[PDB]
Amino acid sequence: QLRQEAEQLKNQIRDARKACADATLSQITNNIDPVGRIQMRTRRTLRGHLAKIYAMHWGTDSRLLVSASQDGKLIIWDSYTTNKVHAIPLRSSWVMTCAYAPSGNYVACGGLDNICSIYNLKTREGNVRVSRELAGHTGYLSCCRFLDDNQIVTSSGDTTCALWDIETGQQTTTFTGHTGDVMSLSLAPDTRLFVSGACDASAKLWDVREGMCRQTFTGHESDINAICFFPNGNAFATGSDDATCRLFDLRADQELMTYSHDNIICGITSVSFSKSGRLLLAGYDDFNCNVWDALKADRAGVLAGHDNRVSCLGVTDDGMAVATGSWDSFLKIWN
Amino acid sequence: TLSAEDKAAVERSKMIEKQLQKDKQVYRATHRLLLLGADNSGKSTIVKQMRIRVKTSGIFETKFQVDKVNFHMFDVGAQRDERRKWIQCFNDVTAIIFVVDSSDYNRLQEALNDFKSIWNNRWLRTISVILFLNKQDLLAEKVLAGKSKIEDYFPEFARYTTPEDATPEPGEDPRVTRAKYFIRDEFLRISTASGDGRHYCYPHFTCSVDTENARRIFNDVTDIIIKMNLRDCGLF
């Protein structure tokens, strides 16, 4: 039947990618000088969480950040004075992700419950209240990011993604091309395309307005846990449980560089790029985080000091500091 | 010195910290458990009989109180068959109450495999598991009927004897007791294959209508509490 057609199409795609492959990223970029040893110091230490922190997100002002822990509380941290700005109590304690609006007026959250809760931080009474509840998914929400003050994309464990309108509250665009549970997604700088990785050992690119899959990169051998976009909007790095990070390019449609080590046999939990994209940070299950060279594939630095599994990483817009959240209910700012 | 805005921010942070401590008091006073089991395991019966909202809800919570101690049991709702990802969220739970049908000889072995996924998990390796062998009356009726033979599914049952520490209930057939203890030992071998002291199993026989099970769970949790207080103080 058509299974042979799918097989021959995949073979043709693989042959085309092999023909378009001239040289690896490590061979062409071998003439440059390495960065060297990166030694980042802890500037601020955030304490106060109860359960294990699962995700965080930085703001556009590079001052305030949002932290989400499984105790049922969203905490707004000040990166400068370490002061708590807002404490939003959640109806469901088993949350897994959080999102900060670009304007700083709304904050989204979700988790095992198939409901994305958006809270308004600019209420006329100075407090925070439930502003919107988006329901309709049939799986746990893994990650969500804001595109504007009226629309938001969400990835759920039902192998589908949905673009919700804050004003209306219904699914405007649905993506069902994935096979496994979508674990994370990253938005492009122009908010036109976004890559999302699922538990099917493959990631897919989707359009916000077109609502169709553009390209698919398998690359890995296990479930992809996190994914982050390159600052230029043309590449993206993915981390999986096989202890190997892989950089793919949307324009090249092939794998660029693989970051791995022999002594590393632990999966990747979160990845993020700096402002320039030269350094790639990745949290591992070995209670430590590693910053590799995106152009040389060498271990540039180790941000050790966490007493539990590293859960989330976050780089500011200006790349002046990096927040690391682990299951020890503490956030650490490194610079 | 700090400005007025800085003082206001410090006061707000202090109020938020006080609220967080007030919430942490209740969070520490309340215990959390994770209920797991197959479709025919009878989880709906255990969720009910609690003597103390959307259609696509993926998590259900049942709050009850035993001996002035609050327990919140969480059950998986509208979720797919893949569980290797979201179950990692339950790494900090007090106990996992896993239900197993005692009469369903077909899926029993399958349940055993599932039990392995709960025991040999790299994230659930330090979490206690309370085994509920549900539907004991159905098992007794099926054993008294004699239509189905356990040897057709488990041949080692033909070479199994009653343990010495067995406690037969007053008014129970010997074959039912033999099958019950055989299933118990089959679960205990899989549990102790990788226990190594860091975690233990809590076997409990559950019938159709039992109101004391929760209380038993309480005792179990109590034991867990001790097993979490002796390793910190340095005595176990």
Epitope: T179, G180, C199, D200, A201, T218, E221, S222, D223, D241, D242, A243, I265, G267 | R80, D81, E82, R83, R84, E110, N113, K116, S117, N120, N121, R122
Partner: nanobody
Framework: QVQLQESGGGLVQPGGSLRLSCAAS????????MNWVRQAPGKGLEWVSD????????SYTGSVKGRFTISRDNAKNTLYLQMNSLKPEDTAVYYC?????????????????????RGQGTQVT
Amino acid sequence: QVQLQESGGGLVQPGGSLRLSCAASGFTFSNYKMNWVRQAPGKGLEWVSDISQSGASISYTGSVKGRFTISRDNAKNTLYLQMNSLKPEDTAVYYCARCPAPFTRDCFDVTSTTYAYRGQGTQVT
């Protein structure tokens, strides 16, 4: 891309013998735990056997314990399963599952209906 190709199934009279072979591609065969499961017509997915990376830990289900034997070939990266003394109730489609996380021993989601790291299966009668 992860790919599992199973072969060796066919029409066999009750009491014969078979040698199923599963070839893996797209990942390291020696660094993952393998499992063989079966699906009967009208019934759900049933686990049959499992073998670890180094082949030291091998386990079988109570239904086929003593009759089937599973083995690995890291040089050829092939999973072999010799089935002897076939029974009429053993007629089922056999599938090969691979553990999602490397260097682990928990076989999670190996019996799920939708699993990416599992081949299309072969007909065995």
